[PDB]
Design a binder for this molecule. Structure first.
Ligand SMILES: *[C@@H]1O[C@H](CO)[C@@H](O)[C@H](O)[C@H]1NC(C)=O
Ligand SMILES: *[C@@H]1O[C@H](CO)[C@@H](O)[C@H](O)[C@H]1NC(C)=O
Ligand SMILES: *[C@@H]1O[C@H](CO)[C@@H](O)[C@H](O)[C@H]1NC(C)=O
Ligand SMILES: *[C@@H]1O[C@H](CO)[C@@H](O)[C@H](O)[C@H]1NC(C)=O
Lengths: 354, 350
């Protein structure tokens, strides 16, 4: 509440300074400035060892930055485990979207794993030998560790740390059970006729038109924790079935997360690595409102597998401009928006149900 | 023109341990700033004059300003409005007085003038008909015949020494506070609900709760839920700053062991809500205490400190209000031994 800053205020036509609350868009910024780090690698190693002994065979990361943290500390955790004679290998793979919940939780260990004080030699520097027992973090590893035996949402941000090139975000294993997204990295603000619900992976803009409505959003992850109402604007009398970004995808439970003529986009292209929600026709396409249209269904891409653009689309009672998702492989339409003449079986469809 | 999600700036971020720049949303504390950097101005003095003239002809005899900034605007345009009215042969004089708190509602509304009228230096003779804005004028123009909340901010305008805020007479009837000048933000463990008169801080303890507030006006419009955090499951009787005093309808405007402070010292020109003992006093939680009543000041009218206070089931540190005349206690907190009849009490009920 007591940060000091200066800014160009475009809506108030002034450049000024003062104290206040400043919410930065670090989602769309090309500069990477935050890195997650364990509060204590030796304590995290002990939590992993205990988790494994309790039948927790791996991790489903909540967020893109958690997976990056696991990848950067993998070698260190394995060296600590080997230093203590623990036959266990942390194996960190890629994130797949959506980042589905797991039901287990890392335990808080009483003690960290200590230093071994082994003879001076290459063991202080080289990676640990691979073992028979893989503690798998994300990756394509469901056969060896099914999702129901993985821990998810076990961390809380303990503090931020100063750094010259990156700002550290220290993560600690929490004691409490929670489904909620970590509020330490959430920033939500409204000013005049625009608002943003944000964290390190979601930048969700709303605006006052005739009513408040979703304006645009950019998501560089697809997480499944619950966005906390404490950090959400205008939460009363909201119907979850009207929330554009579903609750089950960390959508804010807010009138700001709604748009007339659209219901919750549970079958959007949430397999995508990142998505922009934009109310605008896909390139080369037109949408027509007509009750004869097909019904809501899986989101469809505007281009076929061969690259052919589908020119004409419809929706039974949605509103213009149309809801679209912009992804690396092209432009996708809201669930309401179906091809007008083309069979849907010729198109690329979302296989995800959030 | 009205986009505020893409400002650019730099800041010292104490909780994230960084000084950095970027794009985003910046919510400034303009309440506790050293100066007024904003000035309300009518979008058109001549249009406002026409609205006043027609209002007078409809039996609206004056104005109750919604905000401190609106009253300052009326004072600045008074002479010009009266010149315009005199130029058009209208036997009417706008008379602007000071604001009293609370700035109570009125049920009338300025009309959007059907016919427009066809100056900054003219010294208009006073007429026999007074259109009174605020002031100690309730006898000649009762509250039930005054317009209130008739303006909407149309736009901001650049200025070297002050940023202009242009006000237009609105068509629609509303009780809502103008959202054009509201900023609300939460980041991590702290939040603020703010406009040009209220700075309301909340924090995450075991639960989210009111931390502190600074108010430089006491207004009575409704704080819009659109600009409010966490509005569901809220009991309005738990809102520390009452709904009827533009309190946000939020869990952030609550504090365990206190209910809504309808009889706080809202006649104050400015106040700080602070959870802290009044100087030289102690509060004991004990069931033998008196029940909730009008807020009492910690000092007698002659400045003597009442040392020992109690509450039946409030929480420590105690809810207090800091004003120019001293330190006042939340409704729950009563003198432990001294009779209340010896103390200074709030006479207002929000
Ligand atoms: C590791 O696994 C092999 C089988 O591939 C097994 O024979 C061996 O005993 C194991 N090593 C241990 C348990 O130390
Ligand atoms: C609302 O949005 C529509 C289309 O998105 C636009 O044409 C219209 O001007 C807007 N109305 C407002 C901002 O009052
Ligand atoms: C002026 O108003 C007073 C009432 O305050 C009235 O008694 C008087 O007759 C009026 N004089 C005029 C209209 O010349
Ligand atoms: C809550 O505030 C009290 C003081 O009122 C403080 O002692 C305590 O540490 C705080 N608890 C948390 C969880 O911040």
């Amino acid at each position: 509440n007591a940060d000091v800053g200066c800014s160009v205020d475009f809506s108030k036509k002034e450049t000024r300074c003062g104290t206040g609350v400043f919410i930065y868009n670090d989602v769309e910024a090309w500069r990477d400035r935050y890195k997650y780090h364990p509060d204590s690698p030796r304590r995290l190693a002990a939590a992993v060892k205990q988790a494994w002994e309790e039948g927790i065979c791996g991790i489903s990361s909540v967020s893109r930055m958690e997976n990056i943290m696991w990848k950067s500390v993998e070698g260190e955790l394995n060296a600590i485990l080997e230093e203590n004679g623990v036959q266990l290998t942390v194996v960190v793979g890629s994130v797949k979207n959506p980042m589905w919940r797991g039901p287990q939780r890392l335990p808080v260990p009483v003690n960290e794993l200590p230093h071994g004080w082994k003879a001076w030699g290459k063991s202080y520097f080289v990676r640990a030998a691979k073992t028979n027992n893989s503690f798998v973090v994300d990756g394509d590893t469901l056969k060896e560790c099914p999702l129901e035996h993985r821990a998810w949402n076990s961390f809380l941000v303990e503090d931020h740390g100063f750094g010259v090139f990156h700002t550290s975000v220290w993560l600690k294993v929490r004691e409490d059970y929670s489904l909620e997204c970590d509020p330490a990295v959430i920033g939500t603000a409204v000013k005049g006729r625009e608002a943003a619900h944000s964290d390190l992976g979601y930048w969700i803009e709303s605006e006052k038109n005739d009513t408040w409505r979703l304006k645009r959003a950019h998501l560089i992850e697809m997480k499944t924790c619950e966005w906390p109402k404490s950090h959400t604007l205008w939460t009363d009398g909201v119907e979850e079935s009207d929330l554009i970004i579903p609750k089950s995808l960390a959508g804010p439970l807010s009138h700001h997360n709604t748009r007339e003529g659209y219901r919750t986009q549970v079958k959007g292209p949430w397999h995508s690595e990142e998505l922009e929600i934009r109310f605008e026709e896909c390139p080369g396409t037109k949408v027509y409102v007509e009750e004869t249209c097909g019904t809501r269904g899986p989101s469809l891409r505007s281009t076929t597998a061969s690259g052919r653009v589908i020119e004409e689309w419809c929706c039974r009672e949605c509103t213009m401009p149309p809801l679209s998702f912009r992804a690396k492989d092209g432009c996708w339409y809201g669930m309401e928006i179906r091809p007008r003449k083309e069979p849907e079986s010729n198109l690329v469809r979302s296989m995800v149900t959030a």
